[PDB]
Amino acid sequence: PLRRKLWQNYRNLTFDPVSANRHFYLSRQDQQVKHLRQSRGPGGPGSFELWQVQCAQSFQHHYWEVRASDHSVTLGVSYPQLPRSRLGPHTDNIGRGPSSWGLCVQEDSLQAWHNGEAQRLPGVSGRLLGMDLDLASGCLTFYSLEPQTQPLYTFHALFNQPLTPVFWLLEGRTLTLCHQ
Amino acid sequence: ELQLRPYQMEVAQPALEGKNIIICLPTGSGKTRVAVYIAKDHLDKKKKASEPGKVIVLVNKVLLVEQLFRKEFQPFLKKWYRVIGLSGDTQLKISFPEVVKSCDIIISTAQILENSLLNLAGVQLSDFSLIIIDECHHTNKEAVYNNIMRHYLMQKLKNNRLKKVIPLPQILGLTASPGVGGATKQAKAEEHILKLCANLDAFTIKTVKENLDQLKNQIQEPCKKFAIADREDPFKEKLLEIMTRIQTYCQMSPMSDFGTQPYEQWAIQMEKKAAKEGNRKERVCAEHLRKYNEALQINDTIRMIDAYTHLETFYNEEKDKKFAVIEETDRFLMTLFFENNKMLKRLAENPEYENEKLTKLRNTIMEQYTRTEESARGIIFTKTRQSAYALSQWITENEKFAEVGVKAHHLIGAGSSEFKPMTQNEQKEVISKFRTGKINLLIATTVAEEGLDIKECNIVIRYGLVTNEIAMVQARGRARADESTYVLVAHSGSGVIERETVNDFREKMMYKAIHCVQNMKPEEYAHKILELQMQSIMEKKMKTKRNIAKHYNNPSLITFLCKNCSVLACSGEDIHVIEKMHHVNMTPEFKELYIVREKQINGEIICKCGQAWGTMMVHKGLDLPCLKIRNFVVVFKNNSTKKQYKKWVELPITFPNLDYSE
Numbered sequence A: 001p002l003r004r005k006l007w008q009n010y011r012n013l014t015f016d017p018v019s020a021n022r023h024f025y026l027s028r029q030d031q032q033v034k035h036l037r038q039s040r041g042p043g044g045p046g047s048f049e050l051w052q053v054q055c056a057q058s059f060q061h062h063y064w065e066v067r068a069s070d071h072s073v074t075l076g077v078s079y080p081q082l083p084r085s086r087l088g089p090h091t092d093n094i095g096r097g098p099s100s101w102g103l104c105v106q107e108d109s110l111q112a113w114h115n116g117e118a119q120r121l122p123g124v125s126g127r128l129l130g131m132d133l134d135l136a137s138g139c140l141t142f143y144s145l146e147p148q149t150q151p152l153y154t155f156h157a158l159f160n161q162p163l164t165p166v167f168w169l170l171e172g173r174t175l176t177l178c179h180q
Numbered sequence B: 001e002l003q004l005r006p007y008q009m010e011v012a013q014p015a016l017e018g019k020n021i022i023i024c025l026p027t028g029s030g031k032t033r034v035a036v037y038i039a040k041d042h043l044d045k046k047k048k049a050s051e052p053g054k055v056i057v058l059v060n061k062v063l064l065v066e067q068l069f070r071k072e073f074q075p076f077l078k079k080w081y082r083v084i085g086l087s088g089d090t091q092l093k094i095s096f097p098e099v100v101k102s103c104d105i106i107i108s109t110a111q112i113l114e115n116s117l118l119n120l121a122g123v124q125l126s127d128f129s130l131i132i133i134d135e136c137h138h139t140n141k142e143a144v145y146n147n148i149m150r151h152y153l154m155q156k157l158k159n160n161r162l163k164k165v166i167p168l169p170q171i172l173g174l175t176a177s178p179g180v181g182g183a184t185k186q187a188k189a190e191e192h193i194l195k196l197c198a199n200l201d202a203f204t205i206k207t208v209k210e211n212l213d214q215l216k217n218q219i220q221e222p223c224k225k226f227a228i229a230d231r232e233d234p235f236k237e238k239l240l241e242i243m244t245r246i247q248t249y250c251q252m253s254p255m256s257d258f259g260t261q262p263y264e265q266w267a268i269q270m271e272k273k274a275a276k277e278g279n280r281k282e283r284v285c286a287e288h289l290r291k292y293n294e295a296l297q298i299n300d301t302i303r304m305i306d307a308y309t310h311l312e313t314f315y316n317e318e319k320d321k322k323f324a325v326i327e328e329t330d331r332f333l334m335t336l337f338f339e340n341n342k343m344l345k346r347l348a349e350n351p352e353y354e355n356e357k358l359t360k361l362r363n364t365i366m367e368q369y370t371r372t373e374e375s376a377r378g379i380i381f382t383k384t385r386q387s388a389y390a391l392s393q394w395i396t397e398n399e400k401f402a403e404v405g406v407k408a409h410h411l412i413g414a415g416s417s418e419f420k421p422m423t424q425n426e427q428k429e430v431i432s433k434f435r436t437g438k439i440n441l442l443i444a445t446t447v448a449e450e451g452l453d454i455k456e457c458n459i460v461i462r463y464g465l466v467t468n469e470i471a472m473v474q475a476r477g478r479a480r481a482d483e484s485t486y487v488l489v490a491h492s493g494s495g496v497i498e499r500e501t502v503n504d505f506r507e508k509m510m511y512k513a514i515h516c517v518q519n520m521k522p523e524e525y526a527h528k529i530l531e532l533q534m535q536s537i538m539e540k541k542m543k544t545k546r547n548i549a550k551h552y553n554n555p556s557l558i559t560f561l562c563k564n565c566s567v568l569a570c571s572g573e574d575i576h577v578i579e580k581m582h583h584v585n586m587t588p589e590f591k592e593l594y595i596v597r598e599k600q601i602n603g604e605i606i607c608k609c610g611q612a613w614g615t616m617m618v619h620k621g622l623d624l625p626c627l628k629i630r631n632f633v634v635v636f637k638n639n640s641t642k643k644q645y646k647k648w649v650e651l652p653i654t655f656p657n658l659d660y661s662e
């Protein structure tokens, strides 16, 4: 029922090929992204060195659903000032700086990263996930759908810039959106 | 700060006052500190009573010598005593007896002591007071520890004959898993524990029974995770029809499918039979198909490239040896092989096709390191040395590994006939680098499953390994870190997970049984122990007479023949030995028979067939080629039987040494 109460602020999304990483691949009318060992040629400018992609949409409320192939992936949203280069051997940036909010899912437990800080959250079994963002209250929350609706965690902040979803992926991991 | 944790002092209580006994605590609970503390008390008390007291520490793997030397003994006794760390690699400049006569705490490998004890001037066991024996579960049928303890036991029984004496030094031995000798009975398990105890001449196992929870807090059970996989690629089947054509040419019945251990065993034994017959046109074919088989086995284990390189190297040198004589079934092989191999190199070079196991390995490595975020040390345990080295190359090549910050190196023991032998100094610095942390992933073999104390090991990984129970308990122990993860990787094709299952149940048997013996009645304990002591001695004597009678020899009776050809090589009187070590022939016409070849400081001998015979060596200013008994065939003169031997010790012949007057 709550999902029904949500979907009037549901928003559809699609990626940006420029920001896609080298080994990454876009498909299904730019609504599905897949990771492959083989490179899609050189990366070039406008592409995130680390394994992240951002969608064409940003928000100057909003809800959307996401389905994922398997765990060991990260979903989040950042300011448009997210770094694109690389400085650390680890291949994820989101949540390291205060300009982004992150949530990484693993087979064991959940971790929500921001300003380089994260806490352990009890793990989940399903892969389809949902999330709410309210600009008026400056509140970002994460939900799980299968089998039931779990209000996983809420983030409080004040935003002075539009927010763009950014997704961190692993090899042999595929990520897909939803639309209605 | 030699302040023990409570349980440590608790289990050390019987040890403080004589009572040569054993201590077993679960892995990662610092037994070495117990050894150090006990040693300090022993030496200090003996000094207070003013008697010559010493202690020797025995370890069974070289790497641990330096580890235990500079990590637990140096830092705690730099002011109190003279501790010296000695191993078979360090260039001594002074005899062993004086080494012991100078210092008082020795850290050495057991083989050194046993060498020094069978030299009857040498040394006597009585010269020592305390014998620390680390990882003494290896005390078994004719192992290095068993010999030493059998001398000790023999003296003890002599003392009992005297009573109805000479002091026998106090004994300590450290274990983590005594294990069972493959026993599906409760009786055989508890028996096995008793056999170990008696062979150690212990008094009481003395394992913790008081401070349980704090122990549960110190040690951590790692999380177990299973990676099991089970892609079609013609390369396997491409080798298949090539080799089936090869087998069908000589129309051999396999009696089993290809690529299996029984097939390899059958291939070797039938190749031996063919060489016994003198059957050419078959022998060579048998060896070559064998080579294909081992190539396939490596092929399933590791990537395609190295497996192809192995075969290509063999055939390259094969034709290289063949063309030397220039200066029918033979060519029958290379003709088809070379077209096929060109195609294979074309097929092998394609990296899209990949082994199933390696795939899951890549998944595991990436998942674990990325989840850890730059705080992760991982140890991968393998089986064969070249597996370790090739996996290192596989790490090196694909740049996707390095981006995650994994820094990998391969660690193996010293000593073959392959890429390159790594030497002791190199591995010593390798472990040094690993402790620092700019070598992030370590690929190891059997050498380092017992004793490594790296404080940060989040990841311990087993790659298609099958083994007994101790070699699994210790492997899980290596992850001496919090949230430690133990991952088993294999494919369901072989008996791997089932080996894991039976190993698990066997482990539980062992714990319950040691609890059983833990609670026996002292007099019955003594009777059973004594009886076992006897048993070992009488059986050793019986084996002694069996061996000495088995040894039974004309040095001229036999003559040697090629295997590839059968041309007579030389007779018995032509062979002489250097320092009881190396057989060799001086005969000048025999010098004319063979061919030298170089790729060199030493030359390799080549027959007329092209088969190798021996290697050139220079000794005491003489130039002289040697021979390997594997390369030849023995022929007697009383019975015309065609026999072979892999090594020289089997042959009952005795040779004269070297007239050097020539």
Ligand SMILES: Nc1ncnc2c1ncn2[C@@H]1O[C@H](COP(=O)(O)OP(=O)(O)O)[C@@H](O)[C@H]1O
Pocket: B003, B004, B005, B026, B027, B028, B029, B030, B031, B032, B033, B451, B452, B453, B455
């Ligand atoms: N009293 C103690 N205080 C702190 N650490 C200890 C103590 N006793 C043992 N340890 C730990 O034990 C480790 C040494 O273990 P070691 O004996 O090499 O393993 P094992 O007992 O499996 O051979 C040290 O790194 C140390 O951290």
Ligand code: ALF
Pocket: B026, B027, B028, B029, B031, B032, B176, B450, B451, B452, B477
């Ligand atoms: F318990 Al240990 F080396 F003595 F792991």
Ligand SMILES: [Mg+2]
Pocket: B031, B032, B450, B451
């Ligand atoms: Mg140890």
Ligand SMILES: [Zn+2]
Pocket: B562, B563, B564, B565, B566, B567, B607, B608, B609, B610, B611
């Ligand atoms: Zn020959």
